[PDB]
Design an enzyme around this catalytic site. Structure first.
Site, PDB file in Angstrom:
ATOM      1  N   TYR A  21       0.770  -1.225   0.000  1.00  0.00           N
ATOM      2  CA  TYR A  21       0.000   0.000   0.000  1.00  0.00           C
ATOM      3  C   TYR A  21       0.823   1.310   0.000  1.00  0.00           C
ATOM      4  CZ  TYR A  21      -3.798  -3.162   0.920  1.00  0.00           C
ATOM      5  OH  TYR A  21      -4.672  -4.144   0.884  1.00  0.00           O
ATOM      6  N   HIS A  28      -4.034   6.676  -1.814  1.00  0.00           N
ATOM      7  CA  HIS A  28      -4.824   6.599  -0.590  1.00  0.00           C
ATOM      8  C   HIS A  28      -3.947   6.713   0.661  1.00  0.00           C
ATOM      9  CE1 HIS A  28      -8.932   6.388   0.395  1.00  0.00           C
ATOM     10  NE2 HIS A  28      -9.015   5.129   0.792  1.00  0.00           N
ATOM     11  N   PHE A  88      -6.014  -0.515   9.106  1.00  0.00           N
ATOM     12  CA  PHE A  88      -6.452  -0.505   7.732  1.00  0.00           C
ATOM     13  C   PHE A  88      -7.361   0.711   7.581  1.00  0.00           C
ATOM     14  CE2 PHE A  88      -5.275  -5.044   7.578  1.00  0.00           C
ATOM     15  CZ  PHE A  88      -4.288  -4.898   6.619  1.00  0.00           C
ATOM     16  N   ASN A 131     -10.420   1.534   6.273  1.00  0.00           N
ATOM     17  CA  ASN A 131     -11.833   1.521   6.660  1.00  0.00           C
ATOM     18  C   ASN A 131     -12.105   1.382   8.154  1.00  0.00           C
ATOM     19  OD1 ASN A 131     -11.197  -1.171   6.964  1.00  0.00           O
ATOM     20  ND2 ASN A 131     -12.502  -1.902   5.291  1.00  0.00           N
ATOM     21  N   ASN A 186     -13.564   5.899   2.421  1.00  0.00           N
ATOM     22  CA  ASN A 186     -13.798   4.928   3.494  1.00  0.00           C
ATOM     23  C   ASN A 186     -13.125   5.222   4.822  1.00  0.00           C
ATOM     24  OD1 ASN A 186     -11.728   1.968   2.522  1.00  0.00           O
ATOM     25  ND2 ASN A 186     -11.286   4.162   2.431  1.00  0.00           N
TER      26      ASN A 186
END
Length: 189
Positions: free
Chosen positions: A15, A20, A66, A68, A114
């Site tokens: 990631y 994001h 994470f 969300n 999110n």
């Protein structure tokens, strides 16, 4: 007295370059500038660095729940330190701004994001201070997930780096003035 500054993203090597994760990148730039070292927290699922600036204790946070689940970490941290929502700043990727654009806001609904959705649902308000970095407008028909899961185009690296440096300064100005509205006036546009 206590400031809670949160940069959003997802933990893990895969990631790290995603748009994001601009929040993680911002926080990283901030602590390096402020000579603050991280520690992967034992209580909280987050990387946390803190330091006293004058008489205030400032926490720099990268939730590793994470994206969300960012709200769980944010709420836990606010509850643990008895910090009011007004003492919060969240740094993250805006979903509908040209890449590297900088905007400071004190509101806004989740709009498909999110992380923000999780935070709003956990602290009970969308009225909290934000430092948003543009990652590009999605094309028509493009889903949110592949929009935010893509990496930055190489021609944009410099603009992003320039913006992150500006985020460091906004945070410092914010700390100096203990006023996000003045910070918005000083940095927007």
């Amino acid at each position: 007295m206590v400031k809670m500054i949160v940069g959003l993203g997802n933990p893990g090597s895969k990631y790290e370059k995603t748009k994001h994760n601009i929040g993680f990148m911002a926080i990283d730039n901030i602590v390096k500038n402020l000579d603050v070292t991280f520690t992967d927290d034992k209580n909280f699922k987050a990387q946390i660095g803190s330091t006293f600036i004058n008489h205030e204790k400032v926490y720099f946070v990268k939730p590793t729940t994470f994206m969300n689940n960012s709200g769980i970490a944010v709420k836990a941290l606010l509850t643990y330190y008895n910090i009011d929502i007004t003492d919060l700043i969240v740094i993250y990727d805006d979903l509908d701004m040209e890449v590297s654009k900088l905007r400071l806001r004190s509101k806004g609904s989740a709009g498909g994001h999110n992380g923000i959705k999780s935070i709003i649902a956990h602290i009970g308000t969308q009225e909290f201070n934000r430092i948003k970095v543009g990652i590009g407008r999605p094309l028509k028909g493009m889903t949110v997930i592949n929009h935010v899961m893509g990496q930055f185009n190489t021609e944009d690296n410099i603009a992003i780096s320039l913006t992150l440096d500006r985020v460091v300064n906004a945070v410092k100005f914010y700390l100096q003035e203990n006023d996000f509205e003045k910070t918005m006036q000083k940095f927007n546009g």
